[PDB]
Amino acid sequence: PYYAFAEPFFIHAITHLHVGSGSSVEEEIALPFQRDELGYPTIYASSLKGAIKSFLLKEFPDKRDVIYKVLGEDENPEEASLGTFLDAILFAIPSRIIEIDSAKPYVWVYVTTYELLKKVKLYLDSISQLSNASFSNLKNKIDTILAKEGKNITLDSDLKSAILNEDFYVELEALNNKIPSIINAGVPLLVLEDSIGREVINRSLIRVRRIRIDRDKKVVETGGLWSEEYVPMKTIFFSVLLGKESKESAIFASCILRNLRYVILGGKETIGKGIVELRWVKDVI
Amino acid sequence: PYYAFAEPFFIHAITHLHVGSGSSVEEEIALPFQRDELGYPTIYASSLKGAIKSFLLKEFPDKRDVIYKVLGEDENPEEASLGTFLDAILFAIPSRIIEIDSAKPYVWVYVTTYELLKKVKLYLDSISQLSNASFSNLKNKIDTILAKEGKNITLDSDLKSAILNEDFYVELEALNNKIPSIINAGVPLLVLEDSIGREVINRSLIRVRRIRIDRDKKVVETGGLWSEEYVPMKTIFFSVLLGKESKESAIFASCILRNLRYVILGGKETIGKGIVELRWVKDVI
Amino acid sequence: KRVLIKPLEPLMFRSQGEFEPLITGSHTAAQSLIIPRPSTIAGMLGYILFNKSSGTGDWLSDLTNLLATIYGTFIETNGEYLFPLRMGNHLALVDQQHLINLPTLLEKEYERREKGIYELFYDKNKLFQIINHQDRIGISIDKSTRTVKEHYLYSARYLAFKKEVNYVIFIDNDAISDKINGKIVNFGGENRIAKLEVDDYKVDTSIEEEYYLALSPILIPDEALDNFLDNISDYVAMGKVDKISLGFDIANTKRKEMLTAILEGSIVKRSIIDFIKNEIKNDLRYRFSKYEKIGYNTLMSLCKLALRKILS
Amino acid sequence: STQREYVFIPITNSITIDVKITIGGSDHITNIDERGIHNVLVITGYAVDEKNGRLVPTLDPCDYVKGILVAGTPQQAQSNDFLTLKLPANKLYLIRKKGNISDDLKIYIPYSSPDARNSMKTKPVSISDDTIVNNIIKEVFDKIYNITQKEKVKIEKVKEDIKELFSYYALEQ
Amino acid sequence: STQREYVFIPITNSITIDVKITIGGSDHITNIDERGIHNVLVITGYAVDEKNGRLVPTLDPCDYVKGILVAGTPQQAQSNDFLTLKLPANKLYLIRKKGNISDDLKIYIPYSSPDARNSMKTKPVSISDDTIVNNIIKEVFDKIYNITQKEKVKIEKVKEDIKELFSYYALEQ
Amino acid sequence: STQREYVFIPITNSITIDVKITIGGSDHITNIDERGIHNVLVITGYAVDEKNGRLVPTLDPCDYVKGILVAGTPQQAQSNDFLTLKLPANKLYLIRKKGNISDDLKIYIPYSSPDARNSMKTKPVSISDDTIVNNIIKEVFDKIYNITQKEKVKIEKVKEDIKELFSYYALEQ
């Protein structure tokens, strides 16, 4: 029990969210998303923490002392926070689909790869070994998938063929149509192999050329043209909230987290970007 | 002798890692990792031993005396320490790959250099003498690889060419023999030559700009902008825990060492940077 | 006969505010001597051969009762033999090829010898190609606050090696060069490891010569100090003399001693030997024989690799 | 359920007649899959007396022994002196943990007499002189594992590891 | 020579009548010299059996028992279930040693049979409930060691130190 | 008896015709074995006459001439102006000593006149323009070290020591 409580939770993007490390030179996209160590998108737990914290400080203004104990003081540090965030692993991203043969025809579908599930399994295993919280059913539903690697399987449908992002013909394979769905939605989940999954996912992002127009003469301000990069709606990240034993932590995990559904991650909040529902794994699974 | 037993082990970064050191050389980084002498990341034996001791003093609170004896006391330096870690040597970093002309497609592979392999050799050589369990197979792998020093060699067959970290193109002269997998990751392992391995590795380190936001008006606070450098996930370090026979080092390896496998290293635990897995290379090869 | 000590990792030999040629980026509370003082190698060998027959003693009688005459200490890269060379707060490492013709430099014309000195310590000095001076910061953490434990912040400059480096010392009585071969030891410093590897490499052990090179600090009895520090030109030609503490005895946990010495790497004249011998001739002489026994007073011929103690 | 039989691995041939069950059921804890012997258990604080050397218990932690955990009840003429026991499968000192255990198991141990009449000055014993090993491949590894000399083409692998993986301490008195 | 019989120090009242000899010789290893307890023999791989308190040998190197070492013959109703052994005083794992030992000792250990009918899920147990400490002092640190309450006025110290020094693993069955 | 012949190594093409005995016996003292040239002799107080470069006598010790030692007697067209002597294994200063010498050796030196008609104002030589290095590895290290391009594939190393280890003061007169 290095951590008293351990709370894995999904991060359903309600709008396009843009958590973006302001790029370096070779700005092929001027404002790119936060990239994982293997190229995929991810939410660095620093920004995840500073976004969930600045939120809670408003929502619960009466527990601004519990929060500070678990998420650390900020006005003056005198000891360490008892609550940790893990970096958010991309769990599934939507992809528009064109199904060749299917009983019920779809338009979009969830796409994940095997490296992402391997990372999620690493997280779950380490968390089960650092704390009491065993997540038997989720580990089972993940490593039954991992048993079939190198194949573009499909979880809970009968597709056998599709065109993801209208650019990548894929030949699928049925796991069982008996394994319960990790997500809870009528949309299928595809587990591509990372050869194709990488560029499918890369296509599923959203590059957006934006400008800055002069209010005077309705023409583009000089130099005011750039390109941002959002992750679409319905995309699902995955992180864990961990906590070392205390009594402020018990309140936090038993009161604060139980009323935490919609937070505003990321940047560019003045425009629709950022809103996020976060679902708790042990809650749904 | 006063060094009876050794204990080599790998350090698998489950999450990213940050084992810091004050802003020293700042190639535009404000919180660099711990360099080796050449520029490679490494974990000082000070940090390694301190973090491992701090961890064990909680997951084994009753045995506080055994941990004290084998790893030094806190306020009673009437006796020296009976165990000692060597500086954790970087052994293999991950790297994104776009493999041209290959059969089994890969998105990421491990990457090492002959410098790192020589530094690992030094350890394994200087240890095999006392080590009644001579790792002759592992050391033989490592000194076979080192025969080909000067060529971008791969410990597999089907690469022949690749583009590592989306910037560096390598023609992977294969291995003219067959070598068992150093670890249980089916992922290949490239041993690049130096000065090209310094780039692929230097570019595989997650540098991150971070900020601090005014809690009240979602705007940055002045002077609240710095950068940090993390070691990516799945990175592998190498070290040995030395020891001198004490009849409580016996139990320290009987109960403690074989038991623990996950440890929190480095800083930024609240950002979830430092969960790492310890694999003793005596049960695997 | 000859003992190799390869450091298995960066390692530190604490030094009191002595080295300031290096343009340090940041400060550090303790530097690291480039070559370990012979007290350190002595104690490192004594640690292996320690029993309860020790009893009382000024950390050296008991120490000298364990080993032969250690001779000196110098660097060893692949094949090459690097040797310490100092000109006053300015250290260097050079190979034999440039020791052989120093006397001329030490006595030649003004500007010719300035040229020679310059290109010695800057151009041909292979130090920075071997030794990197990495700094380490250390802290402690109170398990309660889980933050830095206040007032506990130490900064040390370690000695990191860019290539495989050994330390070469010569001893006798291979009756101990058996129980010492292939043994990793906590070579001096905060818990650092180096490997011992003894081979058979015979060298000369006595030579008379105009100029000598001090591979190990030559200790001054301090009864000579007064009548020695006035005529250095008679004895030393180039190097550095200053107080050094012998070390720190593990027996009774105390700083050992202090006395002016000629630091490792220093061109002394043959007028040294007669001075030391014909200055101390009593209990002092026995004390300093105990000293030199553990590799203290050591010279090396500038022409070929040949050593010699002072009082023996 | 299932019941396991642990045998010591000395350099002495006190091993030929100590078991009755080659398989009994269908499984064993220690497996060999083209990579050597794995899931080997090490018994601490117990030693051997090789002339009918059984698990002689000492009180020294550095004293230990290594052995093969296979299923079996020995010869159904013993256990008047054996450590018949049921551990929750994790209190074991398993080496090379490749397979996972079922949280419970019944084990039989060849247990010797204390014999309090002399100093138990143990000595570290290493399994060398591969002749005494090439037969132990036949004396215990072939009288049990039929897969031996059926699938193993890398006999040098199962030959080189035992020398260094297996070692123990003995009174030798 | 000298024979000692190790007696564990649990929280339970299985301590009153277990040994026939209090002094026998003229000295004991465990001393209480104005600093606390010394030379505590710690035995791993054994478990506490609080109901009829004896040290069941387990197969876990993490199960250790901590008690004092005294010379004596057991109750003249034993040598049947007491692990009589002779060790050369350097294979003992002693804690907070002060002096040297006689280089060989014949040792007696309260033992119980493995009881192969219930899985040994041993669980750790510490010394708490300070009045338990007090009544055990009145049962061991005054009965076998009359040195307390004779020259001792530092009873709170030998209380607070035993409050941490001694622990064990119990079968919890 | 025993005889070697030191061959000067200037930057000039004065290496083609001064040798006749390419191996002669069996032993070379200098060895290029996977680490570069070794056992290199340096001579102080001498000079060169690069126009048919032969060793000139000087009295400055800072002047050095580095080269290789091979066995034999040169050309049977000398011993009238060549510096002949016998030095038994210790009056030589070698660079990167790898083997040992058996305390018996006569040395032949290509020697020339004291040249008392112009000051020997001398200046070192930096080994540049590896084209001359390409030719000098063949001129001497292939007409005496015939093992070149037979065992040494690492010619990239056997030239860097020629960039770094070898030099000499040139009279330029």
Render C185-241 in DSSP notation, one character per residue.
Answer: E--TTTT--EEEEEE----B-----SEEE-SBPEE--STTTTTTTT-GGGTEEES-E
Let me know: does E108 contact E6? Beta carbons within 8 Å: yes
Q: Side chain identity at A267, as an amino acid letter?
A: G
Q: How far is CA D73 from CA D84, D106, D146, E16, in A?
A: 10, 10, 19, 40
Residues of chain B neighbouring E44 (CB-CB closer than 8 A): 251, 254-255
Could you give the CA distance from residue F51 to residue F74 in angstroms, rounded to a whole number?
19
Could you give the CA distance from residue E69 to residue C166 in angstroms, rounded to a whole number?
50
CB contact under 8 A, F93 and C104: no
For B66, nearest residue in chain E (alpha carbons)? E95
Which helix (H) or strand (E) element contains residue A140?
helix A136-146
| Neighbouring-strand partners of residue A12 | A236, A277
For tokens 């050794």, the residue is B6
Could you give the CA distance from residue D76 to residue D69 in angstroms, rounded to a whole number?
18
Q: Which of D1, D43, D59, D80 to mutate to test the interface with E (most CBs of E within 10 A)?
A: D59
For A197, nearest residue in chain B (alpha carbons)? B107
Among positive and negative, which fits the CA dihedral B44, B46, B51, B53? positive
Interhelix angle B136-145/B114-128, rounded to 10 degrees, is 150
Residues 6+ apart with CB under 8 A from F129: none
Nearest-CA distance C267 → chain B (Å)? 32
For tokens 């968390």, the residue is A127
Pull the structure tokens for residue B17.
């890692």
Nearest Cα to Cα of residue E130 among E156, E102, E97, E165: E156
Helices (H) and strands (E) in chain C, counts: 8, 23
Q: How far from the centroid of its chain's Cα atoms is residue E91's Cα?
A: 17
Residue A219 burial by Cβ neighbours in a 10 Å radius (0-12, 13-18, 19+): exposed
Helices (H) and strands (E) in chain E, counts: 2, 10
Helices (H) and strands (E) in chain A, counts: 7, 14
For tokens 């050391």, the residue is B139
| Neighbouring-strand partners of residue B164 | B97, B168
Tally of residues, chain D: 173
Let me know: does B1 contact C178? Beta carbons within 8 Å: no
Let me know: does D173 contact D112? Beta carbons within 8 Å: no
Pull the structure tokens for residue A236.
């699902």
Q: How far is CA B15 from CA A123, B233, C37, in A?
A: 8, 5, 44
Q: How far is CA E151 from CA A261, E30, E34, E154, in A?
A: 68, 17, 10, 9
Pull the structure tokens for residue C285.
């002489």
Nearest Cα to Cα of residue A231 among A84, A11, A23: A11
Q: How far is CA D72 from CA D2, D24, D25, D54, E2, in A?
A: 9, 6, 9, 17, 42
Nearest Cα to Cα of residue B232 among A231, A39, A239: A39
Let me know: does B44 contact C192? Beta carbons within 8 Å: no
Three-state DSSP state, A269: coil
Q: Which of C76, C82, C83, C101 to mutate to test the interface with F (most CBs of F within 10 A)?
A: C101
Residues 6+ apart with CB under 8 A from D144: D19, D22, D23, D70
Let me know: does E96 contact E40? Beta carbons within 8 Å: yes
Give the strand order in the sheet containing C2-7: C74-76, C166-170, C2-7, C194-199, C183-185
* In A75-141, beta strands by DSSP E: 83-85, 88-96, 108-112
Q: How far is CA B192 from CA A234, B34, B118, B163, B200, in A?
A: 41, 22, 13, 12, 9
Could you give the CA distance from residue B259 to residue B241 in angstroms, rounded to a whole number?
15
Which CB contacts under 8 angstroms, 24+ apart, belong to E46-49? E46/E109, E47/E120, E47/E122, E47/E169, E47/E170, E47/E171, E48/E8, E48/E10, E48/E125, E48/E168, E48/E169, E48/E170, E48/E171, E49/E112, E49/E170, E49/E171
Let me know: does A91 contact A10? Beta carbons within 8 Å: yes
Q: How far from the centroid of its chain's Cα atoms is residue B105's Cα?
A: 26
Nearest-CA distance D166 → chain E (Å)? 18
Could you give the CA distance from residue E2 to residue E28 in angstroms, rounded to a whole number?
10
Q: Side chain identity at C305, as an amino acid letter?
A: L
Let me know: does F4 contact F29? Beta carbons within 8 Å: yes
Residue A251 burial by Cβ neighbours in a 10 Å radius (0-12, 13-18, 19+): middle
Three-state DSSP state, B30: coil
Q: Which chains touch D (3 or more CB pairs under 8 A)?
A: B, E
Could you give the CA distance from residue F113 to residue F115 in angstroms, rounded to a whole number?
5
Residues of chain A neighbouring C145 (CB-CB closer than 8 A): 78-80
Residues 6+ apart with CB under 8 A from A154: A172, A173, A174, A175, A188, A189, A190, A191
Residue A226 burial by Cβ neighbours in a 10 Å radius (0-12, 13-18, 19+): middle
For tokens 């190498």, the residue is B238
* In B125-218, beta strands by DSSP E: 153-154, 162-164, 168-170, 189-192, 206-214
Among positive and negative, which fits the CA dihedral A119, A124, A128, A130? positive
Pull the structure tokens for residue D48.
């051997």
Residues of chain E neighbouring B61 (CB-CB closer than 8 A): none
DSSP track, B208-257: EEEEEEETTTTEEEEEEEEEEEEBPTT-EEEEEEEE---SSHHHIIIIII
Do A and F share at least 3 CB pairs under 8 Å? no
Residues of chain D neighbouring B282 (CB-CB closer than 8 A): 95
Three-state DSSP state, F30: coil
How crowded is residue A201: how many other Cβ atoms within 10 Å of its Cβ? 26
Which DSSP letter does residue E140 get?
I
Could you give the CA distance from residue C214 to residue C232 in angstroms, rounded to a whole number?
15
Q: Side chain identity at E123, as an amino acid letter?
A: K
Let me know: does C202 contact C221? Beta carbons within 8 Å: no
For β-strands B108-113 and C298-300, DSSP reports them as unpaired
CB contact under 8 A, C145 and A79: yes
Reading phi first (left if > 0) and then psi (alpha if -120 to 50, else beta), residue A136 is in alpha
Nearest Cα to Cα of residue F133 among F103, F91, F162, F167: F162
Residues of chain D neighbouring E87 (CB-CB closer than 8 A): 58-60, 119-120
Q: How far is CA C108 from CA B273, C112, F60, F119, in A?
A: 62, 7, 10, 18
| Neighbouring-strand partners of residue F47 | F56
Let me know: does F9 contact F137? Beta carbons within 8 Å: no
The method recorded for this entry reads cryo-EM
Please calculate the CA angle A164-A166-A172 and round it to the nearest 5 degrees: 30
Could you give the CA distance from residue A35 to residue A13 in angstroms, rounded to a whole number?
17
- H runs (alpha helix) in chain F: 130-139, 155-158, 160-164
One-letter-per-residue 3-state SS of A19-71? CCCCCCCCCCCCCCCCECCCCCEEECHHHHHHHHHHHHHHHCCCCHHHHHHHC
Pull the structure tokens for residue F24.
């002669």
B104 touches D at CB < 8 Å: no
Backbone φ, ψ for residue B34 (5° rounding): -95, 110
Could you give the CA distance from residue C255 to residue B171 in angstroms, rounded to a whole number?
59
Reading phi first (left if > 0) and then psi (alpha if -120 to 50, else beta), residue D7 is in beta
Nearest Cα to Cα of residue E102 among E132, E71, E130: E71
Q: How far from the centroid of its chain's Cα atoms is residue A22's Cα?
A: 19
Pull the structure tokens for residue C66.
């364990």
Helices (H) and strands (E) in chain D, counts: 3, 12
Could you give the CA distance from residue B44 to residue B266 in angstroms, rounded to a whole number?
10
Could you give the CA distance from residue B36 to residue B25 in angstroms, rounded to a whole number?
13
Could you give the CA distance from residue D160 to residue A62 in angstroms, rounded to a whole number?
68
Interhelix angle A194-203/A114-130, rounded to 10 degrees, is 100
Pull the structure tokens for residue D50.
């090789």
Please calculate the CA angle F45-F47-F52 and round it to the nearest 5 degrees: 155
CB contact under 8 A, B65 and E95: yes
Let me know: does B255 contact D61? Beta carbons within 8 Å: no
Nearest Cα to Cα of residue C199 among C218, C220, C174, C229: C174
Backbone φ, ψ for residue D116 (5° rounding): -80, 80
Resolution of the deposited coordinates, in angstroms? 3.1
Let me know: does C220 contact C23? Beta carbons within 8 Å: no
Give the strand order in the sheet containing C267-269: C211-213, C267-269, C236-238
Nearest Cα to Cα of residue C295 among C166, C211, C174, C171: C171
For B203, nearest residue in chain A (alpha carbons)? A37
DSSP track, A159-200: -S-EEETTTEEE---B--S-SPPSS-SSS-EEE--HHHHHHH
For tokens 């299928």, the residue is A188
Could you give the CA distance from residue B236 to residue B278 in angstroms, rounded to a whole number?
10
Let me know: does A200 contact A168? Beta carbons within 8 Å: yes
Could you give the CA distance from residue E134 to residue E159 in angstroms, rounded to a whole number?
8
User: In the Cβ-directed half-sphere of E154, how many Cα atoms lie within 13 Å?
Assistant: 11
A76 touches C at CB < 8 Å: no
Could you give the CA distance from residue A6 to residue A85 in angstroms, rounded to a whole number?
10
Could you give the CA distance from residue E20 to residue B76 in angstroms, rounded to a whole number?
40
Q: How far is CA B257 from CA B8, B55, B246, C59, in A?
A: 12, 12, 15, 37
CB contact under 8 A, F62 and C104: yes
Helices (H) and strands (E) in chain B, counts: 7, 14
Let me know: does A214 contact A225? Beta carbons within 8 Å: no
Could you give the CA distance from residue A77 to residue A11 in angstroms, rounded to a whole number?
29
Q: Side chain identity at B245, as an amino acid letter?
A: E
Please calculate the CA angle A202-A208-A210 and round it to the nearest 5 degrees: 160
Q: Where are the domains of chain D?
A: 1-173
CB contact under 8 A, D61 and B250: yes
Tell me which residues of chain A, numbers 32 to 51, contact chain C at a CB-CB cutoff of 8 Å: none
Let me know: does A122 contact A142? Beta carbons within 8 Å: no
B251 touches E at CB < 8 Å: yes
Please calculate the CA angle B85-B90-B95 and round it to the nearest 5 degrees: 155
Which DSSP letter does residue A83 get?
E
Backbone φ, ψ for residue C142 (5° rounding): -75, 125
C143 touches A at CB < 8 Å: no
How crowded is residue A246: how many other Cβ atoms within 10 Å of its Cβ? 15
Pull the structure tokens for residue C228.
């020695």
Let me know: does B6 contact B242? Beta carbons within 8 Å: yes
Could you give the CA distance from residue C252 to residue C153 in angstroms, rounded to a whole number?
27
Let me know: does E27 contact E49? Beta carbons within 8 Å: no
Pull the structure tokens for residue A50.
């500073």
Could you give the CA distance from residue C49 to residue C69 in angstroms, rounded to a whole number?
15
Among positive and negative, which fits the CA dihedral A6, A12, A18, A23? positive
* In F32-112, beta strands by DSSP E: 40-44, 46-47, 56-57, 64-71, 83-86, 94-95, 106-109
Three-state DSSP state, B164: strand
Pull the structure tokens for residue B33.
């990792």
